[PDB]
Each structure stands twice: as structure tokens, then as C-alpha cells.
Amino acid sequence: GRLIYTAGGYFRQSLSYLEAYNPSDGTWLRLADLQVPRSGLAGCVVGGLLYAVGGRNNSPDGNTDSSALDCYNPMTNQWSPCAPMSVPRNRIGVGVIDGHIYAVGGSHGCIHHNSVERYEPERDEWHLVAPMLTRRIGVGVAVLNRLLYAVGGFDGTNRLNSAECYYPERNEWRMITAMNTIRSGAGVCVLHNCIYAAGGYDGQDQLNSVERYDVETETWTFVAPMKHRRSALGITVHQGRIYVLGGYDGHTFLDSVECYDPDTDTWSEVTRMTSGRSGVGVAVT
Amino acid sequence: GRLIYTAGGYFRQSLSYLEAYNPSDGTWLRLADLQVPRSGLAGCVVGGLLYAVGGRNNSPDGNTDSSALDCYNPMTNQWSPCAPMSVPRNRIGVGVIDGHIYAVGGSHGCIHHNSVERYEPERDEWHLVAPMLTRRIGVGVAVLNRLLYAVGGFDGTNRLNSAECYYPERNEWRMITAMNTIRSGAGVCVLHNCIYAAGGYDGQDQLNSVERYDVETETWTFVAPMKHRRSALGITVHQGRIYVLGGYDGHTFLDSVECYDPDTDTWSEVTRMTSGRSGVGVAVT
């Protein structure tokens, strides 16, 4: 029995919440707060430990982009700090390969990174790898076939529909088939050997369309849309279904959690977060 | 029966409010929204039409500097788009001379402009003119003796107390006496042939001090301070008094409107906006 964790987020300001949802009984746990409130961060799990990467402390009386990496142990309900990244990365994306954390893109003030760095838990160290072809913030990241895909985002002047993927053994990036839709701040995850891109923001609108990339046909295909438009949503896969949590629909910070069943190509609302928020990090362990 | 118009502004996100205050009876009108929420814009009036120039649209899912120029007709309650500027200008200053709009300085991402352009309503065209000596975002702008004065601001590294002056017939800029206090995001206007600079940010605190420039003596002199510290305030002159609207005091987004009477050298709270905001464009017609 694993839990869906949601860390940080934004509503009026950057949040400290760590909460966990149990899809099997519908309950929500309230865990220890983050040491620093952060939105636009990403979550991942390595060796049973939850990690919060990057983001931004939005505060009335000061905004500060985060280069921090923090590790939460579900057995002890405790956060510990780890080595910081080389640069602050707000609206970061991350993926894990072989127990290593890849920090992709994100922004530091007006600087929109294309740089990518890699965290080795055993040595508590970051090291830069090859930079992406495109600068990308609000970028979705997915790991598929031991490759690191970077989908959509915002390069500092346009929101993007392009995607590229990274070859860890070769340390190089190649562009792949662009999506049907321009998307920054979409939910990007892997489910049954496909990359899903759900929701997002094209500079004017919030999306509810969802498309998935099939590797061997190099095609993006639309699937069923979500019930709510959302940008800056959290996303994860638990037991063969996609969960999207919160986000922003243009007027509301959502507390809705929708669940995508790939057998019926159907979305449904399965729970509500304890309060509406966007820009969360999400992971399952 | 001229009204004080306040357009756009910022509270957590950029706003699209067009509201008009009547200093005679104390009432507030709610006029048609801007098509695009914008903060850090400026307002000005040419031939009875209200113009909204530049700024930036902050939203929880991403930000977009503006190069837009929009024209609001009080007789029709309708906004019409105009030709855009050559570049986006957030934290812009504007002044009007002979029915032409000068767009001064401001930022686009990492770029801090010293460029300046001129809009001709009769042609719906913008044309570049001589750039300032200094790059200036959050610059105050006032028109006096058919010259364009650019006061204070932020050059990308430091906040400025310098000020310079533009000669339309000669197409050139000249530094003038610098102010006593460093000020970005001050309110700058002309009352009784002097240039007032009210509030702003000195790189450390928001200010409530006000100083005025006498051209005959080339000197800046403090007058009575405002009661509330504020940077990124709106400002205008109506029937011989200075009105400042909203701003930011370092924690709160003010709704306070203060009025300065030069005969008595005293400020007074005369009304409150319908909600606290900073970074508005203001003009009277």
C-alpha cells in the first residue's frame, strides 16, 4: 500500500504543506511541513525517500527562487536538507534514472535555464550534464526506456509544444515529435509505455486536453480530456491510473483530484485536497 | 467634471480594473476591464482618450511583459487596441507632448531599456527617438516646459537618484541635478511648474518622503511626506493637488489615496480604492 504525496504549492502565497492521499481508503494524512514554503517544485522518490526539488518561495514582502533539495523520510516524518543545485530552478521538472535525480530547466528570476544537473544520493552531490536544446520552464519530464524526455514549457518568449529527450549513456539531447498543443505547466507522466501530457497553459488559456506520445509510432494522440482545465497541476501514476491534483483553471486554485483510467479512457473525480492550490510536487511511495 | 482614472495594477496577480474616482462627490465608477490584465503599465490622456501603455501580465502559471498600447474612450466605455511598441516595456514611464505619447525605458525579461519611442495617434505609428543616457525601469516621467524629464528608476544593477531631460526639437538627452533620495517606482508629476517625486524604493526601504525640483534653481527640495510609505504608486494632478493611489509598502498592497495641497504643504487621506493594488496607470480626463 503506497501513498500519493503532495508537497508545497501556491495559494495566495507559497505553501509548506506535506500531505499524503491513500487511494485505497480515500483518506488524507497531514505530515511534517516543508522547512521553506515552495511552489513550482517537483517531487520524486529514490530508495523510499521523498525529495522536493527547486521551486519558489512566493511571499507578500519578497519572492525567492529555490535551488534547494530536501529529503523527507516517511518512516520518521522528518525533512533533512541535501546539497543545493548549481542554480535556483523555479517551475522545474525532474525525473529519476537508476536512483539519480535529474533537475531539468526552470527559472531563476529572468533567466530561463536550459541546463540540466544530476543528483547522486550516495555521494550527496550535483553535477551538470549536457544542456537541453531549448530553454524550458514549466517543463514536463518523463522517464521512458531509460531516456529522459522534456515536454513543452516556456523558453522566455514563447510557450512550447516541442519536446526533446536525453540519452544518459551518450550525454546528448535530440528533439522528438512535437505535441499537438502548446503546453507549459502540464502534467507529464509515463503510463503503459506512453508519455501523457495533461492540461497546461499556452500563454492565454488553461487546458483540459490530454495527449499521449507513443514511442514506436512517434505520434502524439489526443485521449479523453479532464473535467477541469488546469495549469500547474501535480500528476503521478498509482496502480495503472493517472492522478492529477489541483492546479489553476483561470479563476480558481483547484482542490479537485481527477483519476484517469486507461482501460475506459475515462476521467473521474476521486477526492479533493484539503485546500485548493497549484504548483505542487507529487510522488508515490 | 474631470475624473481620476486608474487602470490595471497588481495584487498577487495583475489586474484589469478600469475604475474612475470623482474628487467632487467621492464616488467610484467601475468601467470596462482591460482586455489583458497588466501591472507596471502607465496611463495618459490625448484628446479625451485614455491610453494604457506597456506593463506586464503576471498570472500564477506564467508571466508576460507587454508591448501593448490600448485606447479607452470614456464616451463609449470601450477599449480599442492600437499599434504595439517596438519592445515590451514593464515598469514603464510615459509623457505626452503635442498629443504624442513618449514611452520611456522599462524592462523586457532581463533587458533594462534606455530606448524611448514616440506614438502618434493620428498615424497609429510608433517611432524610436534618442535613447536615454541611463537604462531605467520603474522610471518617473513628467513633462515640463515642453521637455521630457526621466527621474530615478533602476538600471538593472542599482536604484537611481539621477535624472535626465529630453529635448524634442534637438532629439537629445541631458543629465540634470540628481535627487536627494534614490527612488525607483516613485510617483512623478508636475504641479505649479515643479517636478514632484513621491515615495518609491531606495534599494532598502519603501519611502514616504516627497521632494520637488525647481527648474529655475536646479534644486530638489523635500516637502511634507505622505503618511504611508509606498513604491509603485499611481499619481496624477487634479485641480491643483497631487493624488497618489495605492502602491506597496513592503508588506501591504495599499488601497489608500492621499492628496497633497501645495498651499498648506499637507497630505490627506481622501478615499480608498475598491481594493489594494500597486503598479497602476493613472490619468485624468
Q: How do beta strands A281-284 and B13-14 pair?
A: unpaired
Q: Is B170 on the interface with A (CB under 8 A)?
A: no
Place of cell 519536446: A163
Lookup: cell for B41: 503599465
How far is residue B280's CA from residue B210's CA, in Å, rounded to a whole number? 19
- Selection from B190, B148, B193 nearest residue B172 by Cα: B148
Cβ–Cβ under 8 Å, residues A165 and A176: yes
- Selection from A209, A279, A267, A206 nearest residue A242 by Cα: A267
The total of structural domains in chain A comes to: 1
Number of Cβ atoms within 10 Å of the Cβ of B24 = 11
Lookup: cell for A167: 540519452
Cβ–Cβ under 8 Å, residues B16 and B6: no
Place of cell 546539497: A83
How far is residue B24's CA from residue B256's CA, in Å, rounded to a whole number? 17
Q: Out of A60, A159, A278, whose CB is closest to B60?
A: A278
- Selection from B218, B209, B201 nearest residue B160 by Cα: B201
Number of Cβ atoms within 10 Å of the Cβ of B94 = 27
Q: Out of A110, A184, A253, whose CB is closest to B62?
A: A184
Our CA angle for B8, B12, B18, nearest 5°, is 15
- Rounded to the nearest angstrom, the gap between the alpha carbon of residue B22 and the centroid of all alpha carbons in its chain is 19
Q: Is B109 on the interface with A (CB under 8 A)?
A: yes
Interchain CB distance below 8 Å, A201 and B62: yes
What is the strand order of the sheet B281-284 is part of? B28-31, B18-21, B4-7, B281-284
B217 contacts: CB under 8 Å, gap ≥ 6: none
> How many residues are listed for chain A in this entry?
285
Q: Out of B60, B64, B109, whose CB is closest to A248?
A: B60
| HSE-CB for A209 with a 13 A CA cutoff | 14
Interchain CB distance below 8 Å, B62 and A279: no
Q: How do beta strands B172-175 and A266-272 pair?
A: unpaired
How far is residue A217's CA from residue A219's CA, in Å, rounded to a whole number? 5
Q: Is A61 on the interface with B (CB under 8 A)?
A: yes
Distances (CA, A) of A67 to A36, A92, A181, A241, B127: 12, 10, 30, 31, 42
B239 contacts: CB under 8 Å, gap ≥ 6: B23
Number of Cβ atoms within 10 Å of the Cβ of B281 = 28
How far is residue A109's CA from residue B109's CA, in Å, rounded to a whole number? 9
In one-letter notation, the amino acid at residue B28 is W
DSSP state of B23: T
- Selection from A127, A116, A104, A120 nearest residue A40 by Cα: A104
B170 contacts: CB under 8 Å, gap ≥ 6: none
Lookup: cell for B154: 533602476
Interchain CB distance below 8 Å, A248 and B12: no
By what method was this entry solved?
Answer: X-ray
DSSP state of B171: T
Cβ contacts of A278 on chain B, cutoff 8 Å: 60-61
* Secondary structure element (H or E) that encloses residue B82, with its range: strand B78-82
Q: Is B251 on the interface with A (CB under 8 A)?
A: yes
Chain A nearest-CA distance from B204, in A, is: 12
Lookup: cell for A260: 484517469
Lookup: cell for B207: 519611502
A263 contacts: CB under 8 Å, gap ≥ 6: none
Q: Out of A60, A111, A248, whose CB is closest to B61?
A: A248
Our CA angle for B118, B38, B164, nearest 5°, is 40
Helix H, strand E, coil C: the string for chain A is CCCEEEECCEECEECCCEEEEECCCCEEEEECCCCCCCECCEEEEECCEEEEECCEECCCCCCEECCCEEEEECCCCEEEECCCCCCCCECCEEEEECCEEEEECCEECCEECCCEEEEEHHHCEEEEECCCCCCCECCEEEEECCEEEEEEEECCCCEEEEEEEEECCCCEEEECCCCCCCCECCEEEEECCEEEEECCECCCCECCCEEEEECCCCEEEEECCCCCCCECCEEEEECCEEEEECCECCCCECCEEEEEECCCCEEEEEEECCCCCECCEEEEC
Lookup: cell for B211: 521632494
| HSE-CB for B97 with a 13 A CA cutoff | 19
Question: Based on the number of CB atoms within 10 Å of its own CB, is B124 exposed (0-12), middle (13-18) or buried (19 or more)?
Answer: exposed
Integer distance in angstroms from the first to the last C-alpha of chain A? 9
Q: Is B250 on the interface with A (CB under 8 A)?
A: yes
Q: Left if phi > 0, otherwise alpha if psi is -120 to 50, otherwise beta: which for A40?
A: left
Question: Based on the number of CB atoms within 10 Å of its own CB, is A174 exposed (0-12), middle (13-18) or buried (19 or more)?
Answer: exposed
Number of Cβ atoms within 10 Å of the Cβ of B195 = 25
B101 contacts: CB under 8 Å, gap ≥ 6: B44, B46, B51, B53, B69, B94, B95, B118, B119, B121
Lookup: cell for A107: 527559472
CATH assignment at residue B45: 2.120.10.80
Domain that holds residue B221: 4-284
Distances (CA, A) of A174 to A118, A212, B57, B100, B216: 18, 19, 33, 50, 65
Distances (CA, A) of A201 to A19, A22, A26, B65, B196: 26, 29, 29, 16, 42
- Selection from B90, B78, B8, B89 nearest residue B283 by Cα: B8
Per DSSP, the three-state class of B201 is strand
Q: How do beta strands A210-214 and A219-223 pair?
A: antiparallel
Number of Cβ atoms within 10 Å of the Cβ of B239 = 9
How far is residue B108's CA from residue B92's CA, in Å, rounded to a whole number? 10
Q: Out of B60, B110, B252, whose CB is closest to A111?
A: B110
Chain A nearest-CA distance from B219, in A, is: 34
Distances (CA, A) of A44 to A53, A131, A247, B162, B179: 8, 21, 18, 49, 52
Per DSSP, the three-state class of B43 is strand
Strands (E), B131-264: 140-144, 147-154, 159-167, 172-175, 187-191, 194-198, 210-214, 219-222, 234-238, 241-245, 256-261
A199 contacts: CB under 8 Å, gap ≥ 6: A183, A185, A186, A187, A206, A207, A208, A209, A210, A226, A229, A230, A231, A233, A244, A247
How far is residue A146's CA from residue A61's CA, in Å, rounded to a whole number? 43
Phi, psi of A122 (to 5 degrees): -60, -25
- Selection from A106, A110, A91 nearest residue A9 by Cα: A91
